[PDB]
């Protein structure tokens, strides 16, 4: 006949992967040089990354340069849209699938006039600027993350250049900027709050996301809270029986009091809930202890226990 009341909260494992938002920049160049003069067209395209100075323009003012420069064995090739010159073009919203990614693209070339035929067929050059917004997901060990369109990056999302997180990509590709201003399309003309963004060059495109600490992901999730449980001691175990959910949780150890090791996330959550519940009940009860006690069930469940004692009015 050893019974004690209290308040109980049950936490379970987290299986939903960590998720965050990314944005991608790329430059697309297409060649229609194979006009088959000899009457069909055989065009091949290519994609390229974006440098730092250009990304600052796109993120804030939504403008890009329609000119790409490459290099190969000391040979450099420069192309312009419609064979023009170095100029600034705007980016406009582009329609797409409902509830998906959002794309901003610049207009293509004005025209593609025919040229010569036979060996030297008509050659056309076009360049486009693209911006895409999607989401990415990563799992518990944080070895890689995958974007929406299906592109994988072999790097932990929490890496910052001086941490111990996994980073198997090229060394001279990752750099992090501080006090970075990025604004949305609808509010061109307002300065937002500076943040810390991380950039990565994948050769074919560029990726950027807001850097954050590892304390933003937590491996435990709240399941239920019970208000009128009763703790009964059986000598070598403790039974927490509640008649609201009709459940009984049995722990292997009697003393328990195993303080959380790495599950320090819930300290703020349990502190608010227990304090809130006790206030509505403190009319006829007093706290029998000052510190919350933690146990672990035979199954994978974590319990927070705070005994309560009645007040002798």
């Amino acid at each position, epitope marked *: 006949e050893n019974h004690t009341e209290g308040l109980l909260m049950v936490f379970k494992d987290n299986i939903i992967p960590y998720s965050f938002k990314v944005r991608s920049y790329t430059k697309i160049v297409t060649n229609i040089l194979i006009y088959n003069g000899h009457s069909v067209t055989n065009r091949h395209e290519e994609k390229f990354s974006v440098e730092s100075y250009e990304t600052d323009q796109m993120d804030t003012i939504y403008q890009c340069y329609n000119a790409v420069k490459m290099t190969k064995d000391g040979l450099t090739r420069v192309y312009v849209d419609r064979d023009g010159v170095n100029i600034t073009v705007n980016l406009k919203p582009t329609g797409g699938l409902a509830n998906g990614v959002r794309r901003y693209a610049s207009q293509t070339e004005l025209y593609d006039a025919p040229g010569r035929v036979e060996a030297t067929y008509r050659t056309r050059t076009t360049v486009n600027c693209l911006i895409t917004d999607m989401m990415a997901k990563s799992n518990s060990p944080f070895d890689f993350f995958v974007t929406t369109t299906g592109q994988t990056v072999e790097m932990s999302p929490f890496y910052d250049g001086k941490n111990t997180e996994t980073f198997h990509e090229r060394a001279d590709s990752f750099h992090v900027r501080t006090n970075y201003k990025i604004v949305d399309y609808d509010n061109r*003309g307002t300065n937002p709050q500076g943040e810390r963004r991380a950039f990565l060059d994948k050769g074919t495109y560029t990726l950027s996301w807001k850097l954050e600490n590892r304390t933003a992901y937590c491996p435990l999730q709240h399941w239920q809270t019970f208000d009128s449980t009763i703790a009964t001691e059986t000598g070598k175990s403790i039974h927490f029986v509640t008649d609201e959910g009709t459940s009984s949780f049995v722990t292997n150890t009697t003393v328990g009091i195993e303080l959380p090791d790495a599950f320090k996330c819930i300290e703020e959550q349990v502190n608010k809930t227990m304090h809130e519940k006790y206030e509505a009940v403190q009319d006829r009860y007093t706290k029998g202890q000052e510190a919350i006690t933690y146990f672990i069930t035979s199954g994978g469940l974590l319990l927070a226990w705070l005994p309560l004692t009645p007040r002798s009015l």
Partner: antibody
């Protein structure tokens, strides 16, 4: 440079236009903002036309009194006032915006004289 | 639509003492800018982002703040530092200015 001509007389009921010549910088990378400064009072914002575009964001109450426009070729901006009255005698400045710390060059200011 | 309130109106201060003017906003703002306008001239920028210094502004001028409370302070005031000072916001699209502060020497 950002120079503005002044010394103009306003006839009530007749629309007036103001010019703000911009030179020495790329005109398609910033914005022009027009501000009205009533003498003896604080400054007031009107709107901000975006060159290279047409994003003329206007004030919450100046829709019926303002009209912005630009000549990309002549690198110039203009302020059109519709049905001016005698209570709006003030000085108007054209300012350059931008998300870069480099500069935001304030204009000189055009005085407006409206009377009988 | 955020309205800026400048509680100080008349300084009438003499050289020798520090002077501080605070700008209060009805709502939260990301940053704040300070403009000094001498009579018969266009205003000039002094402080941007509530903590930085413009070009040509001497070390004396400085300010700080957070949320909806900001202020500017100076160290060695001379005769030429008697002008009007305005606080302007940027986050909300209507670029609302402030009441302004008059500084006098006596």
């Amino acid at each position: 440079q950002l120079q503005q001509p002044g010394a103009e007389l306003v006839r009530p009921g007749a629309s007036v236009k103001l010019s703000c010549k911009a030179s020495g910088f790329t005109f398609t990378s910033y914005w022009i903002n027009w501000v009205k400064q009533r003498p003896g009072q604080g400054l007031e914002w009107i709107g901000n036309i975006f060159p290279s575009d047409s994003y003329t964001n206007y004030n919450q109450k100046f829709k019926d009194k303002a009209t912005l426009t630009v000549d990309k070729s002549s690198s110039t901006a203009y302020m059109l006032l519709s049905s001016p009255t005698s209570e709006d005698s003030a000085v108007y400045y054209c300012t350059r915006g931008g998300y870069r710390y480099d500069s935001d060059y304030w204009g000189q200011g055009t005085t407006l004289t409206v009377s009988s | 639509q955020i309205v800026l309130t400048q509680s100080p109106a008349i300084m009438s201060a003499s050289p020798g003492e520090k002077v501080t003017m605070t700008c209060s906003a009805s709502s939260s703002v990301t940053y704040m800018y300070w403009y000094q306008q001498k009579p018969g001239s266009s205003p000039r920028l002094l402080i941007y982002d509530t903590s930085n210094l413009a070009s040509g502004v001497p070390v004396r001028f400085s300010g700080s703040g957070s949320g909806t409370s900001y202020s500017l302070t100076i160290s060695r005031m001379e005769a030429e530092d008697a002008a009007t000072y305005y606080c302007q916001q940027w986050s909300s699209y209507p670029y609302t200015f402030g009441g302004g502060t008059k500084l006098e020497i006596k």
